[PDB]
Amino acid sequence: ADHKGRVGHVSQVIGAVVDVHFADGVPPVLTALDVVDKLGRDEPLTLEIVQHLDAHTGRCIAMQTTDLLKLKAKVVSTGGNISVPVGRETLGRIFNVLGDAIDQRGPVGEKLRMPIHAVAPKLADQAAEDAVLTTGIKVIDLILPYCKGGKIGLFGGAGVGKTVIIMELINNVAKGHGGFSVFAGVGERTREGTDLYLEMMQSKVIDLKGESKCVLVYGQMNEPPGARARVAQSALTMAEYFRDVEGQDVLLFIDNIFRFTQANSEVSALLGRIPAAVGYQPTLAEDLGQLQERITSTTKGSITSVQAVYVPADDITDPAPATTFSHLDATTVLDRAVAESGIYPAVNPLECASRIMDPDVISVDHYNVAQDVVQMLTKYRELQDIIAVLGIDELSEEDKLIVDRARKLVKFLSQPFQVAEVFTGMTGHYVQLDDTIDSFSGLLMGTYDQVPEMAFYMVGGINSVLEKAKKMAEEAAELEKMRRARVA
Amino acid sequence: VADHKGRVGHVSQVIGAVVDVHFADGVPPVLTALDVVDKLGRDEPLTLEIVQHLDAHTGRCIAMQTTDLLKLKAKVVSTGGNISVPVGRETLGRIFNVLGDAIDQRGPVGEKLRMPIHAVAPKLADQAAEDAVLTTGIKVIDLILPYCKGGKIGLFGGAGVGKTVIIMELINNVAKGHGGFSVFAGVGERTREGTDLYLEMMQSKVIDLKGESKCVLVYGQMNEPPGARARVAQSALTMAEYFRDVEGQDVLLFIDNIFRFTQANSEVSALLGRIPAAVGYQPTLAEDLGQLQERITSTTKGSITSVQAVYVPADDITDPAPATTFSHLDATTVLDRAVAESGIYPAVNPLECASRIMDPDVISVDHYN
Amino acid sequence: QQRTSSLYNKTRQFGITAALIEILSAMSSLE
Amino acid sequence: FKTTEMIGYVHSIDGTIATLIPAPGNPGVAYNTIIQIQVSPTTFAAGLVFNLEKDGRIGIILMDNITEVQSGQKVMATGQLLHIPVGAGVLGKVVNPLGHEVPVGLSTLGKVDTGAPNIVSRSPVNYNLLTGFKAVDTMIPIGRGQRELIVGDRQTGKTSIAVSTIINQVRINQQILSKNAVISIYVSIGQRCSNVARIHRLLQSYGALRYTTVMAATAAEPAGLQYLAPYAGVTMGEYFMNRGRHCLCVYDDLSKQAVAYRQISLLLRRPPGREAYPGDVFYLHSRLLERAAMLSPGKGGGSVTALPIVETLSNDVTAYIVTNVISITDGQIYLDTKLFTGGQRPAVNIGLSVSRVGSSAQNAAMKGVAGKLKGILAEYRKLAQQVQTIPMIRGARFVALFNQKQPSYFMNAIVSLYACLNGYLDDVKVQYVKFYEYLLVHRDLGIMYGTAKNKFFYMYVQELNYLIRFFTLNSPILHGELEEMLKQHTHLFLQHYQSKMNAIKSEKDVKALKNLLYSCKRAV
Amino acid sequence: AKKYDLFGYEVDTNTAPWIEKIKKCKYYDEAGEVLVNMNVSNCPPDIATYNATLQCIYQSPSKQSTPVDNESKFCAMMDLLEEMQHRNRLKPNEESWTWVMKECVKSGQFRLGYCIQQVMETECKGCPADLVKANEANAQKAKTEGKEHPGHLSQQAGLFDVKV
Ligand SMILES: Nc1ncnc2c1ncn2[C@@H]1O[C@H](COP(=O)(O)OP(=O)(O)O)[C@@H](O)[C@H]1O
Ligand SMILES: Nc1ncnc2c1ncn2[C@@H]1O[C@H](COP(=O)(O)OP(=O)(O)O)[C@@H](O)[C@H]1O
Ligand SMILES: Nc1ncnc2c1ncn2[C@@H]1O[C@H](COP(=O)(O)OP(=O)(O)O)[C@@H](O)[C@H]1O
Ligand SMILES: [Mg+2]
Numbered sequence A: 001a002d003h004k005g006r007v008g009h010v011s012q013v014i015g016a017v018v019d020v021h022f023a024d025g026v027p028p029v030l031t032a033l034d035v036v037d038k039l040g041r042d043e044p045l046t047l048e049i050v051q052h053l054d055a056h057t058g059r060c061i062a063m064q065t066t067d068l069l070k071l072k073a074k075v076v077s078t079g080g081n082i083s084v085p086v087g088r089e090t091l092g093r094i095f096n097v098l099g100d101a102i103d104q105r106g107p108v109g110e111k112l113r114m115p116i117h118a119v120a121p122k123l124a125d126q127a128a129e130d131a132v133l134t135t136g137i138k139v140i141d142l143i144l145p146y147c148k149g150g151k152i153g154l155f156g157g158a159g160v161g162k163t164v165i166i167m168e169l170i171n172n173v174a175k176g177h178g179g180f181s182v183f184a185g186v187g188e189r190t191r192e193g194t195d196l197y198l199e200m201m202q203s204k205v206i207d208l209k210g211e212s213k214c215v216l217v218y219g220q221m222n223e224p225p226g227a228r229a230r231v232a233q234s235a236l237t238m239a240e241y242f243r244d245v246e247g248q249d250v251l252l253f254i255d256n257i258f259r260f261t262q263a264n265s266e267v268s269a270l271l272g273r274i275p276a277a278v279g280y281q282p283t284l285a286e287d288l289g290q291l292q293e294r295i296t297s298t299t300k301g302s303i304t305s306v307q308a309v310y311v312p313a314d315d316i317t318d319p320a321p322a323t324t325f326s327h328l329d330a331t332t333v334l335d336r337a338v339a340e341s342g343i344y345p346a347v348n349p350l351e352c353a354s355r356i357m358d359p360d361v362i363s364v365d366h367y368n369v370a371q372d373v374v375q376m377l378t379k380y381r382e383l384q385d386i387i388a389v390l391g392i393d394e395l396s397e398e399d400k401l402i403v404d405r406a407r408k409l410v411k412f413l414s415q416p417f418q419v420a421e422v423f424t425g426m427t428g429h430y431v432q433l434d435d436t437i438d439s440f441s442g443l444l445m446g447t448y449d450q451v452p453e454m455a456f457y458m459v460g461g462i463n464s465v466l467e468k469a470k471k472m473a474e475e476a477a478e479l480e481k482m483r484r485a486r487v488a
Numbered sequence B: 001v002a003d004h005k006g007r008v009g010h011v012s013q014v015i016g017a018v019v020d021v022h023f024a025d026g027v028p029p030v031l032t033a034l035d036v037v038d039k040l041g042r043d044e045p046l047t048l049e050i051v052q053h054l055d056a057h058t059g060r061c062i063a064m065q066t067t068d069l070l071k072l073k074a075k076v077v078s079t080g081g082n083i084s085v086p087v088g089r090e091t092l093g094r095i096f097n098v099l100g101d102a103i104d105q106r107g108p109v110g111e112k113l114r115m116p117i118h119a120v121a122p123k124l125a126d127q128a129a130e131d132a133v134l135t136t137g138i139k140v141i142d143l144i145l146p147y148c149k150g151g152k153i154g155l156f157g158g159a160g161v162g163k164t165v166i167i168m169e170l171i172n173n174v175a176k177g178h179g180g181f182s183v184f185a186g187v188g189e190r191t192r193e194g195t196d197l198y199l200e201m202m203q204s205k206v207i208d209l210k211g212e213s214k215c216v217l218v219y220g221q222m223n224e225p226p227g228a229r230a231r232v233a234q235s236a237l238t239m240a241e242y243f244r245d246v247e248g249q250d251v252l253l254f255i256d257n258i259f260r261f262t263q264a265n266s267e268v269s270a271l272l273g274r275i276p277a278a279v280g281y282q283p284t285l286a287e288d289l290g291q292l293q294e295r296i297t298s299t300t301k302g303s304i305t306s307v308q309a310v311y312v313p314a315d316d317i318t319d320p321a322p323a324t325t326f327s328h329l330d331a332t333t334v335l336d337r338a339v340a341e342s343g344i345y346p347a348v349n350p351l352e353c354a355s356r357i358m359d360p361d362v363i364s365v366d367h368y369n
Numbered sequence C: 001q002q003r004t005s006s007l008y009n010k011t012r013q014f015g016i017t018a019a020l021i022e023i024l025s026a027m028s029s030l031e
Numbered sequence D: 001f002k003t004t005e006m007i008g009y010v011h012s013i014d015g016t017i018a019t020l021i022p023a024p025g026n027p028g029v030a031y032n033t034i035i036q037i038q039v040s041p042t043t044f045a046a047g048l049v050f051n052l053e054k055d056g057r058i059g060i061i062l063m064d065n066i067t068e069v070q071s072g073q074k075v076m077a078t079g080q081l082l083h084i085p086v087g088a089g090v091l092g093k094v095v096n097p098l099g100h101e102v103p104v105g106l107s108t109l110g111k112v113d114t115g116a117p118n119i120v121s122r123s124p125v126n127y128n129l130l131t132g133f134k135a136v137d138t139m140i141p142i143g144r145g146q147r148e149l150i151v152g153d154r155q156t157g158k159t160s161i162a163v164s165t166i167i168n169q170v171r172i173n174q175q176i177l178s179k180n181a182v183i184s185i186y187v188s189i190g191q192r193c194s195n196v197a198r199i200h201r202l203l204q205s206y207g208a209l210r211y212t213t214v215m216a217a218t219a220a221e222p223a224g225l226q227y228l229a230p231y232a233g234v235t236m237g238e239y240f241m242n243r244g245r246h247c248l249c250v251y252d253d254l255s256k257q258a259v260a261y262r263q264i265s266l267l268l269r270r271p272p273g274r275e276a277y278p279g280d281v282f283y284l285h286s287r288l289l290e291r292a293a294m295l296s297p298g299k300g301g302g303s304v305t306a307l308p309i310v311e312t313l314s315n316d317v318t319a320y321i322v323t324n325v326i327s328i329t330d331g332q333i334y335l336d337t338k339l340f341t342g343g344q345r346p347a348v349n350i351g352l353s354v355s356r357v358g359s360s361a362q363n364a365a366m367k368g369v370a371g372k373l374k375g376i377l378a379e380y381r382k383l384a385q386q387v388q389t390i391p392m393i394r395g396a397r398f399v400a401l402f403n404q405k406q407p408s409y410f411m412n413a414i415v416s417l418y419a420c421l422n423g424y425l426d427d428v429k430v431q432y433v434k435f436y437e438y439l440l441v442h443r444d445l446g447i448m449y450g451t452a453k454n455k456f457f458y459m460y461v462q463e464l465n466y467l468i469r470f471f472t473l474n475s476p477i478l479h480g481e482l483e484e485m486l487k488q489h490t491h492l493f494l495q496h497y498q499s500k501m502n503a504i505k506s507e508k509d510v511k512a513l514k515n516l517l518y519s520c521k522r523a524v
Numbered sequence E: 001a002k003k004y005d006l007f008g009y010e011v012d013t014n015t016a017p018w019i020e021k022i023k024k025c026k027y028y029d030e031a032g033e034v035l036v037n038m039n040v041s042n043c044p045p046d047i048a049t050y051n052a053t054l055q056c057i058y059q060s061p062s063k064q065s066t067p068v069d070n071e072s073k074f075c076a077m078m079d080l081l082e083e084m085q086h087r088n089r090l091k092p093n094e095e096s097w098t099w100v101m102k103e104c105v106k107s108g109q110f111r112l113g114y115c116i117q118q119v120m121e122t123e124c125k126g127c128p129a130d131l132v133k134a135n136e137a138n139a140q141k142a143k144t145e146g147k148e149h150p151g152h153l154s155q156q157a158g159l160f161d162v163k164v
């Protein structure tokens, strides 16, 4: 690094976007710069160069707030990109976008630091390992099964069950997992970050005295756009170390990937770029490109990323989710009308899809049963428009039996989550893959036609359905005997 | 005292109704009225109101009349402050325009005083602590949707349902029960509809030529450019503010139509070069209604009680122009055609109506029950 | 009828926002 | 404010925004700082710095005396971020976002631009916050430090439920230690001026001004103040939070703040996106609401509870500003327009409403009764010619009990709900539930007629409130004594008071019954 | 012994300095201001600290220099018990509830006294006589003098005509 401590001065300050004049030429692009000048600040200021204007001037973005920043303030280069610590010394600790420890537990052991802006793997580095990751959830495992090494996305509007599903997956999958994990808190609630840190400390996935198996990198809503943009990459650098260097299966958790795109939409406006469709940055597809391509299963290791995706204004045609859909292996779509009707998790199975939904990867019995659920639900949505116009009695004899089964399929797709005991007021249910396939298979055959509809609502497998149906038969027998007591 | 009084400037640029003016001794303040002294080729005068400042010596304006025959470098002189409009009992019976010139050909007005169009809305201390009922003397209104003192009141009803009849009755009934006067803001109205109001008021003797008048008319009609139609709502409101504050009285205001205020500002806002917000309206839509509607309120000194017409464009109630207005309103009066044609006049459909003061705290318990 | 009319009204307003953002994003390119 | 150096002259104005030219020397003001423009020799006009251009020009957001600002006027700088008056001395007064007190009819400062508490700084919400509504405090319980949204249409009771939550604190705050007193901060963004006056009088009559301060940026005042009003509100609350005390913050409303911020952004040519709002309109509400929190034991254990109000247009939650605030807050309290006109006031749609940290927030006594109510109302809503189960009877009485104008005291609420839970209002008809509840709270039938003989538990003794909060109703201390009170009240009400309804079949008596029952809806 | 908070950071168990601040009390609202200042300096209230506060509530006259509306030493006292039991997770010892019984007999609120001797008998071993007879004295004092309860509630028949 020859440009190591090369001095410059602040040319212009318009929001988080800041221009810097360097006397002996501008540094490279993506180069981190510390603002040495004193001011009345409590916290430091670090600028990353995004553009060059001329040979001597370079436009940047602020990771901290740009308050009290005077013109002509002294600025000095770091030597390269923003550097973040990696390796097993990071496990257990919380970090920010820059890589400073924000948990007050002494200095980190860091034997190495890597740059945030790494290049994505080439075609030769890619490798496919098509194995099913059993999430213990009925809608996912049956219809849109998550694979090992898969990039998975949870699309849904505000307050539909994204953060609930990530927490259930951490219970269901991330606990019994021999690899480590990384959580990119990209522009989400600071208060949700505490509850994850405490619940992991109680369950001992993070351990203070002993072995830890999680890393936390948070750049939350309170932080300015420069941090919230770059914080996704900081976490991804740590996961890349466990993938490439240590050669390991790793989990990544980005809640929320929309907040990356939205954070870039703020700076892109202030940089003076002309906006594309619906006011987003013109580099929207390219921003997601360079980020999402780094998240992949290499020959050296394997990232298996669950992501949350906010659908703004419940508009799935919006660029921010629509562009993301192409990158994912299992696309999970959450609908608001499904949530408000009573079905949790709020998974609309027709808009969902998975790559490993294939007779080669999963078993033949899995594919055939899963397709029949999708076929039956497609017929049911067509019949639902006829009932609204004509009526329930107007339907045919065979179509009525399809509705009775399809109504039970929609109810049986609901599941009480173990993390959501406070919400549902009932204990959780981990439903096995063999249980999920067999129970749904029998429902399609018509073996459970005489079983009532509300038995299937908010339960696990078939044993819990028949248990609730027994409780319904007993309680209905008691209430009937009360109205049969009086005579004449 | 009055500084910048006759401070001379020259017309820098003329692009439509929007006109820039260069002043040698610095620009006047914002909202300052300017008379164009140059030339006698025009048939009507030209008066510009400064909206923006470009530099220390130049200021951008809007024309209240047409900008025809206006040469560059034409002599322009300040008035002293904002556009000034006559007030007091000498205004009663007369018709006015946005500026305050008499447009009825009945000699010069008696004006003992003139007030500025752009007044500030009352402070917290000036507001009434008694939500009080304004007794209209009408059964459907007073019982079911009672109009309050200081209230913004809304008159919903299609063409030919009894709107102009109800406004005229309120002008009578304010003057019977509270002895109050009335003001009619013809905001972006049909010029031909303005004649029929003037004649029907003369026949019913709310306006009287030979004797006592109890109405003021301030009209800024469709033929006029957007600068006038925008500011004409405030001109009428200044006259009602005099009867409220100075004379200490219960007064009615009649704005037909308040949408045409918002729409008139949407035209100027486009010509000023401002980027439009939702559905192509000005970005200051909520602020424009804010400064206008907040001036219409019950002070400690008096009470203005404005009944307003609101056009819902394309029958879309979610549109910004009505939707923003709904927060300001107190008593929503809905007139139905089927009720009118059945024989019931006034044609008030009481189920669709509502009032804020329909409450056991404000009105009596026997009234509410 | 209620819910389709609402979608007509949302499409009316969303159309005019999108119309004008494109039209005025043009003249930002033209200065 | 404190002037320091004359940084430049005013060049252009465009309503509430301006740009400056630097004075000879080019001193250059600091970013995000206040600057005073000399409108006259005696008077100044404040403004915030938003753009520092390469030319030397400085973009200003005008705040005060906007009509008096002119081109060519001198501009003094502070060289400091916006600080405002904060403390106990500011309580019982109306104040601007800049800090100037507003007159009404007849203190170390704090930064408005402040970072929120980090991950280890916060803790789980355990302390309850009583709104004083049986509908809310059972089903959608608010904890201290929580952000609970209030959504719904115009005239659905969004302000009233927020204002009555502040008024509900006075009865507790007067009796309790001031360490645990809920100091309130009502922020009035873009509202009508008379509405602020009526709330001032309403707060004054219930003794709320002692434990409340009113932030105010009315519709007359500019967008710069409206934009900044919720930020100034939190600053005043954070003083109490950082000094180990609990606080409440109402923003009424964030919809009008966003419109004010959109005006500012559009007037300065910031590229607009969805519904013409700028890119960072999410970031606007996010950094506001995240500053509201529940701090750890290590930093005092104080709190700022947030009640942001957000107006929806015709029950449309899919709007951009509404969907943004829902994704930030910890659930919502949805107010339906059909329930309002239907009768239920407050019109709380329990199915649509939700509290993300409800169970842990509630009191031990309130958790006992409320857990059952979820089971009863779930079955009642599903089951809703006739055919009445026990859940159908008892479920309908809860709906009648949830109607109330002014907020209920914790003792008077929980006992009337406990009566309905164990089934003391089953024989009592649905229309006479409010008359039954009124005679329980204010009067007492056991002490009236004869058959009293309770050693301690009565309803006139308001001090039992805090014993109930400790031990709960389902407990060996209070269970037997409580079930006497209710047995005496039901038997005497059914025998002596409800016997009139079979009688009374004449005009001056049916009307007298109505006017009695109407007034019973107001007083809980 | 050593102690840690919910996260696992070190916590100041040095209570004794903050106890003597509560003893110099004068008015009982100042005790709460001290209880704030301990928590602010990572020092959670001890079981002895709550009892030291409870003492100040009993001894001193009112809240502060001026009297507040609806003061209630009992309500301020019982709030502090709710804080230590539920939130801070500390069982109040025998000293805690004895301070509560004293305030019932001192102020004259005997009806509360009946409820809290039942509490003291059941929860924390027992209620040793002294205050039981003093509480029973105030019960008989209300009966023999005039009447127990307000009296405005008892006499009012009402029946259809009741003011709201
Ligand atoms: N499995 C579930 N059971 C019950 N409620 C749920 C479930 N999943 C989501 N919810 C509801 O959705 C709300 C918000 O979910 P969350 O995932 O935190 O928001 P988002 O989907 O916007 O990330 C919760 O308050 C909860 O009531
Ligand atoms: N109070 C009333 N009594 C009798 N006729 C009425 C009354 N109000 C309105 N009308 C009738 O309705 C017609 C239209 O009313 P008007 O208010 O003139 O409509 P607009 O406001 O559209 O001009 C009139 O020609 C008149 O005959
Ligand atoms: N719980 C309630 N009971 C009876 N009336 C109420 C209640 N809450 C609000 N109101 C009344 O409804 C009207 C609208 O209430 P408000 O809170 O102003 O709604 P918004 O905030 O949506 O404008 C007011 O006149 C108010 O007095
Ligand atoms: Mg979430």
Ligand SMILES: [Mg+2]
Binding pocket: D158, D159, D160, D252
């Ligand atoms: Mg409101």
